[PDB]
């Protein structure tokens, strides 16, 4: 005979990382609203991470970002046009610089969503990491308004949580956005308000910064008569609610017994 239940040639089954799944659903969701996804460098200049986003030196707004400062000689940190950029080096504290980046290299109107690994000098506990992921949004063009920001988030929420879901917007402060705002989503099987991310209408001084950088590069102004809305949305938090993960520290851990648990998901 040939015992037909007898285990077969055990080949390797691959899998994706929790964050990858979550990042994916995220971009998939936004690309159906016409957002295209681009990435940026993890090692950034202070000019892109801070100055171009209206976060100035010795300003009390920089305390929202506990920053890793890097040193090192002979390291080409390439700018939006591949030009060699100078400036005091650091690790991205948010993906936000990518939108100054992108705006210099392209022209309105556009929709983009940018994922990335981001860094903060913070104490690794169970609901906090020193290294985690953000997903940015930027929609710039003539006529764009805050109604469209709300619309986007409303759309995000509908897709991540179903019809029984609703979104909440509250004023809050970011230097690179005014009117600024924090947004929360209502998740039915939890009866809970999720603080998801921050957002707003991209700040006049940001547009100014990019058009200025443009000139230095010899490019034409492109952001004098357009408006925009950006948002920043933290991904681990969201992945935790979705896959039911009790501890953020797991993501960076390497535990196969952990990773393997996600082979199924789609």
């Amino acid at each position: 005979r040939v015992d037909v239940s007898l285990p077969g040639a055990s080949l390797f089954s691959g899998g994706l990382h929790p964050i990858t799944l979550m990042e994916r659903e995220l971009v998939e969701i936004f690309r159906a609203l016409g957002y295209q996804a681009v990435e940026g460098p993890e090692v950034e200049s202070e000019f892109f991470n801070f100055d171009a986003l209206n976060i100035p030196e010795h300003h009390p707004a920089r305390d929202m970002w506990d920053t890793f400062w890097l040193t090192g000689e002979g390291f080409r940190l390439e700018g939006p046009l591949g030009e060699e950029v100078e400036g005091r080096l650091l690790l991205r504290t948010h993906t936000s610089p990518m939108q100054v980046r992108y705006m210099v290299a392209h022209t309105p109107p556009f929709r983009i969503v940018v994922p990335g690994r981001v860094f903060r000098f913070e104490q690794t506990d169970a609901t906090h990491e020193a290294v985690f992921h953000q997903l940015e949004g930027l929609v710039v063009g003539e006529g764009i308004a805050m109604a469209h920001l709300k619309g986007a988030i409303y759309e995000l929420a509908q897709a991540l949580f179903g019809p029984d879901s609703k979104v909440r917007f509250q004023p809050v402060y970011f230097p690179f956005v005014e009117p600024g705002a924090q947004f929360a989503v209502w998740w039915p099987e939890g009866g809970k308000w999720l603080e998801l991310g921050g957002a707003g209408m991209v700040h006049p001084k940001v547009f100014q910064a990019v058009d200025a950088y443009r000139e230095r590069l010899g490019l034409p102004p492109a952001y004098r008569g357009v408006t925009g809305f950006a948002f920043g949305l933290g991904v681990e938090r969201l992945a935790m609610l979705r896959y039911g993960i009790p501890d953020i520290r797991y993501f960076f851990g390497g535990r196969l017994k952990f990773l393997e648990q996600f082979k199924g998901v789609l």
């Binding site: 080949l11 691959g14 952990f258 082979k263 199924g264 998901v265």
Partner: protein, 785 residues
């Protein structure tokens, strides 16, 4: 539809050129497949008169004495060659397209033929080669080049879509062009009519078939060749001239999409009767074939006394007997509207497609018969010296078209455009609609001839194309989609991942026809197919796929015979048909297997498959095992049902050698199963920080026992604290019970909060010793660190 530039130019004089007409008709909704230039006629072809035709004694040939400026002779074998007509005379030296060799004076049966008279084929204007081209004897002064009265034409090949039957008349087309703003010239139909009775009546016994039917009366006809300009026009449109009255009926028709037929009164008797055909009734039609009519066929018949006889096959083809010839002095002119469906049926029932039918299938202007009668009668008067009565015979009272509500605002709204009302309303008028009222919503009634104008949105397309699809802006919609539409794409997406994970796994996908060979059900040993083709491409493709795998097998054969590949791992996803339509996924293995192509060891056959598969499901996150169950199309030794997440979904196995035999191939391994695959939701299992407990011990079990039952049993009793349960050695032989077997099992335990004491282990494993020995098993090994 052949559309000859110069002919259209008669109705629409201002046309710029064949090419801007091509692009003009394009925006109107009419695509041109080709543009051809047609009548190259050399210097050597002159017009000539046949003074006399003289039979050549002993031959079937005639000596033609022609006035061609000077007098000349030629010999002709043509039936119609005869005195009193004009011919096209190719003189010595002439390079003709349709003969390649030159034209000279040669000697034929005693007489020097000074060139030859031409057929339509020889000249190059038509396919016909059975007779001389025949012209009016006076068409030209003797000797003049034909070119001078027969210029080259360019003719566009237009497709005319079913909604535009009016476009099956060139004057139809002209009207469209007219709406773009080109000037129109409708032909004036000059009739000098006479008040007097029609020497025949009309009895239409089937208003169903002929909701409108008219007869005109023309008498004292001088039947003869058509003028040059008509012969030229007709030849350009793909028809061949016959004479005078026949040609006029074809010329109108091509003009205004209105087939019509002249019956010679000789054969008509007391009257025309438009009626159904009596069973088996016969009729020799124009094309000269004897036919046998069907009761459903509508015939144009005549009667005399108690005699009733078919005269033509209504709306399709006239009879042969009553066709108008040189000796005809008077005709009844049929000009009607027929039942499109009836004509359609008749036509297919007889294997006939004609310019006449076709237009009657697509449909003709329900109030055009009378305007048409006039145009024809007029022409007949002009070209055949017809005298014609004032009265028509007429039967049918068709209603005018109804008005359609139309709102310029809806128009602009439906299109995204911003056309000023005034412009909309004017275009609508140029196309011939009446438009009453003051707005916002208009009373607008179309011309009878636009069959395609019934709805308000019909009218909008009408302003759109006249205005230009190019004048429609570009734009993108914004809207929050309705809730019931949310995640409506889940299924589709699910299936695409399947495919994609499959490519990543190592599987090659293949598309197979959905058809199946009915004989194949026997071959691969399947229950019969339930869906059959009332009209297959062929008997091998006469049923509907009940399984994916047969096609997989048949396709392996197909490229073993071609590219002799050494191994394959195929997968197909297709719809299959039985009870309900369901989605299936089938896979296929074969050949040496996998390893080091330079070494010898290989993994292949059944467990290679099962290995690739349990890996697949590893990735989909679904539980997977296969049990023992025969399948008519498998090995009775390599046969399993597939069990994803505990429910049966198809089969895994190795082809039946007896079928491998019949189809002439090595052992193939396949699987087939129902999609969609069961979903399993994440139940994230927070691991355990605290260490695990390892120990090994094998199980001695009878040979036939399926690995499943044991694994199952070891597991189910092993306890609420087990981890990696897996098999790591199959040994068979001494010193085991005369042919039994032991299974080497790796075990591991663990506890979430606390840690595992040796007490809770050795116990719970002896609790597995319980249901294991108490079933007929026992340990070859025990407690091995």
């Amino acid at each position: 539809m052949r559309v000859p530039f110069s002919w259209l130019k008669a109705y629409v004089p201002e046309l710029e050129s064949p090419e801007v007409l091509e692009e003009r008709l394009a925006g109107l909704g009419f695509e041109t497949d080709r543009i051809e230039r047609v009548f190259p006629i050399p210097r050597g072809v002159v017009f000539a008169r046949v003074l006399e035709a003289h039979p050549i004694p002993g031959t079937r040939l005639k000596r033609l004495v022609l006035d061609a400026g000077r007098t000349v002779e030629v010999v002709s074998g043509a039936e119609n060659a005869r005195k009193g007509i004009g011919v096209a005379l190719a003189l010595p030296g002439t390079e003709l397209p349709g003969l390649g060799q030159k034209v000279g004076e040669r000697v034929i049966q005693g007489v020097r033929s000074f060139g030859m008279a031409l057929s339509p084929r020889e000249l190059g204007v038509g396919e016909y080669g059975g007779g001389l081209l025949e012209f009016p004897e006076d068409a030209l002064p003797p000797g003049t080049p034909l070119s001078e009265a027969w210029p080259e034409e360019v003719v566009l090949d237009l497709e005319v879509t079913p909604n535009r039957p009016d476009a099956l008349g060139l004057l139809g087309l002209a009207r469209d062009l007219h709406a773009l703003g080109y000037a129109l010239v409708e032909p004036e139909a000059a009739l000098k009519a006479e008040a007097l009775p029609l020497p025949f009546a009309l009895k239409v016994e089937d208003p169903e078939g002929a909701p409108h039917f008219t007869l005109g009366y023309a008498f004292g006809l001088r039947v003869a060749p058509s003028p040059l300009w008509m012969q030229r026009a007709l030849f350009a449109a793909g028809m061949r001239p016959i004479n005078n009255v026949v040609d006029v009926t074809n010329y109108v028709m091509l003009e205004r999409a209105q087939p019509m037929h002249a019956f010679d009164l000789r054969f008509v008797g007391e009257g025309i009767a438009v009626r159904r055909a009596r069973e088996g009734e016969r009729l020799k039609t124009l094309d000269g074939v004897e036919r046998t009519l069907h009761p459903e066929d509508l015939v144009i018949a005549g009667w005399r006394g108690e005699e009733s006889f078919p005269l033509g096959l209504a709306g399709v083809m006239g009879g042969a007997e009553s066709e108008v010839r040189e000796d005809t002095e008077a005709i009844a002119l049929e000009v009607a509207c027929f039942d499109p469906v009836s004509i359609r049926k008749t036509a297919r029932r007889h294997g006939l497609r004609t310019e006449a039918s076709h237009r009657f299938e697509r449909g003709v202007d329900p109030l055009g018969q009378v305007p048409a009668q006039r145009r024809a009668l007029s022409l007949l008067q002009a070209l055949a010296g017809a005298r014609v009565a004032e009265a028509l015979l007429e039967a049918g009272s068709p209603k005018p078209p109804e008005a359609i509500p139309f709102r310029p605002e809806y128009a602009n709204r439906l299109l995204g455009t911003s056309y000023p009302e005034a412009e909309q309303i004017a275009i609508l008028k140029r196309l011939g609609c009446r438009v009453e009222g003051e707005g916002p919503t208009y009373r607008v009634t179309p011309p009878s001839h636009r069959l395609d104008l019934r709805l308000e949105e019909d009218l909008v397309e009408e302003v759109a194309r006249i205005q230009g699809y190019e004048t429609i802006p570009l734009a993108l919609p914004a809207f929050f989609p309705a809730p019931d539409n949310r995640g409506v794409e889940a299924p589709y997406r699910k299936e695409q991942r399947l495919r994609e994970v499959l490519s990543g796994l190592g599987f090659q996908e293949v598309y197979t026809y959905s058809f199946m060979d009915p004989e194949d059900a026997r071959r691969f040993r399947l229950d019969p197919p339930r869906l059959l083709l009332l009209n297959p491409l062929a008997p091998e493709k006469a049923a509907l796929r009940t399984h994916l795998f047969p096609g997989l097998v048949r396709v392996l054969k197909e490229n073993l015979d071609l590219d002799r590949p050494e191994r394959a791992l195929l997968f197909e996803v297709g719809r299959v048909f039985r009870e309900r339509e369901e989605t299936h996924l089938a896979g296929l293995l074969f050949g040496e297997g996998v390893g080091l192509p330079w070494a010898k060891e290989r993994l292949s056959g059944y467990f290679l498959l099962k290995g690739y598969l349990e890996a697949l499901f590893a990735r989909l996150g679904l539980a997977f095992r296969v049990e023992a169950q025969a399948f008519p199309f498998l090995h009775p030794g390599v046969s399993g049902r597939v069990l994803v997440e505990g429910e049966e979904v198809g089969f895994l196995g190795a082809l039946h050698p007896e079928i491998a035999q019949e189809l002439e191939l090595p052992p193939v391994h396949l699987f087939e199963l129902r999609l969609p695959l069961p979903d399993k939701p994440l139940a994230f299992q927070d691991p355990s920080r605290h260490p695990a407990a390892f120990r090994d011990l094998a199980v001695v079990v009878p040979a036939p026992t399926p690995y499943g039952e044991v694994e199952a049993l070891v597991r189910e009793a092993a306890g609420p604290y087990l981890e990696s349960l897996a098999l790591f050695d199959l040994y068979q032989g001494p010193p085991l019970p005369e042919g039994h077997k032991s299974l080497a099992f790796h075990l591991r335990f663990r506890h979430p909060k606390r840690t595992l004491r040796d007490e809770e282990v050795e116990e719970a494993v002896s609790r597995v010793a319980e249901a294991l020995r108490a079933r007929g098993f026992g340990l070859r090994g025990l407690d091995t660190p």
